[PDB]
Structure 1
Amino acid sequence: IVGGYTCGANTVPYQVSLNSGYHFCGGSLINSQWVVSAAHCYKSGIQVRLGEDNINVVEGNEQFISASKSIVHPSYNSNTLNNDIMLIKLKSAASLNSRVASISLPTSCASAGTQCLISGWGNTKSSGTSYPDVLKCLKAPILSDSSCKSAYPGQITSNMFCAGYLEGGKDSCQGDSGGPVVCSGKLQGIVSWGSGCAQKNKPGVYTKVCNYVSWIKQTIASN
């Protein structure tokens, strides 16, 4: 995350690390034995890590749970990214304390101008590299579906939605993919893509979680 600040040992209890040797993606636990993440973050052999502060160090408040099964999404298409979402089932289901908690699904896509909380373990240097040990945090408003397109000519869709600062310098970045973009108890966004990181007229882009509300009920009901 570029431009953010340190969150604080578990303050984002629903935040998880998608791991397979090393941390490659985000993930916000939506409940007991499940995890919501990105489409492109899909791989074979996920090990979900919950309740972490320093990812490169054990602190007995972590829970390593492999991935019983890792679903993806129908329309998901790699080229345009439209429909960027994956669903992960835990071989088990954690304890759910203060540190490790569940976020909550939306009811109605939040409007623009809304300050949301975006977080991850990605890069904190736009032009460069400086991947942090502790989880970083960023407050950011939603841009109008109007302005989103205004920056990414013919690339947005009924799902992806920008968020961030048009002037830039503060945004989500490499490492953060599959992260949570919360706005008042509601898991409204999922880290998806963007040209570079935090660069004027090149805000980030996170998929609309509200438009997969049903999709999930089903996918969890079954599978």
Structure 2
Amino acid sequence: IVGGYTCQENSVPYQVSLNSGYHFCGGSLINDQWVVSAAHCYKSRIQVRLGEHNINVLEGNEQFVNAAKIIKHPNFDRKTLNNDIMLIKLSSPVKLNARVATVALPSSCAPAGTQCLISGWGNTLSSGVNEPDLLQCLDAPLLPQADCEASYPGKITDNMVCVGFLEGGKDSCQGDSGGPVVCNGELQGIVSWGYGCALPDNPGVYTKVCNYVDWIQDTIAAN
């Protein structure tokens, strides 16, 4: 997160860190056994870390669980990052409590103009890299699809949404990938891609989660 602020400890209780020996992506806990992340965060072994605030210091609220099934959307296209969504079933349910809780799936697609919260331990600089220890938060609005399509001529599908500021300075960045944008209590987007980080006229683009609620539900049920 570039241009954000440190989240109050465990105030984003559905945020998880996906770790392979190091944090490489974030995700959202949607029930006590399933996590939604970006299909481009796929790795064959993933340890999911919940209850995290400082990703590097054991603070005493963490639960670390291994992914048992990691399911990428069957139409995920690696080249356009269309359908960049993945589901991870944990190998055992987690203990839901104050610092570890669920986020709701969307009842409808949020309108342009909605303020959302994006969070993650991803890159905090618009040039070079600096990985933060503490979870970062960003308040940012959902942008009109016309503004999204204008920034990325020919690359935005109906499954992608832009969130951010066209003047730049504040955005998600590599490492935030797979994590949440929550607007009015529901998961509306997943951090997916953008050109650079926090650049003028290059807003971040997010998987539009209200397009996948049937798939997320079919898949949890069949699994």
TM-score if structure 1 supplies the norm length? Answer: 0.99
What amino acid sits opposite 1:211 in the alignment? N
Q: Distance in 2 between matches of 1:190 and 1:67?
A: 19
Q: What SS is found at the alignment partner of 1:132?
A: coil
Q: 3-state DSSP class of the match of 1:40? A: helix
1:29 CA displacement: 0.3
TM superposition shift of 1:123: 1.1
The C-alpha deviation readout for 1:51-84, integer Å capped at 9, x for no partner, is 0011111122100100111001011101110100
Q: Which residue of 2 aligns with 1:155?
A: 155
Give the CA deviation at 1:7. 0.4
C-alpha separation between the residues in 1 aligned to 2:32 and 2:53?
20
Distance of 2:88 and 2:132 partners within structure 1: 25
> What's the CA shift string for 1:148-195, capped at 9, x where partnerless?
010100000111111000000000001100010000111001000000
Counterpart in 2 of 1:193? Answer: 193
Alignment partners' CA distance in 2, 1:124 and 1:8 = 17
C-alpha distance in structure 2 between counterparts of 1:36 and 1:57, whole Å: 25
- 2-structure distance, mates of 1:80, 1:98: 38
Structure-2 residue corresponding to 1:165: 165
Shift of 1:8: 1.4
Which contiguous aligned blocks of 4+ residues in structure 1 show a shift greater than 6 angstroms?
Answer: none
Distance 1:61 1:172 in 2: 25
Query: Hey, what does 2:113 align to over in structure 1?
Result: 113
Pairwise CA RMSD = 0.6
The percentage of counterpart residues that share the same residue type is: 74
The amino acid across from 1:141 in the alignment is: P
Q: Secondary structure at the match of 1:92?
A: coil
Counterpart CA distance in 2 for 1:192 and 1:28 is: 14
Matched, 1:93 2:86: no
Structure 1 residues 2-54: Cα deviation after superposition (integer angstroms, max 9, x where no partner): 01001011000000000010000010000010000001000011000000011
Matches within 5 A, 1:41-120: 41-120=41-120
TM-score by length of 2: 0.99
In the alignment, residue 40 of structure 2 is paired with which amino acid? H
> Which position in structure 2 is the counterpart of 1:144?
144
Tell me the CA shift for residue 130 of structure 1: 1.6
Contiguous gaps of at least 5 residues in structure 1: none
Q: Distance in 2 between matches of 1:69 and 1:75?
A: 18
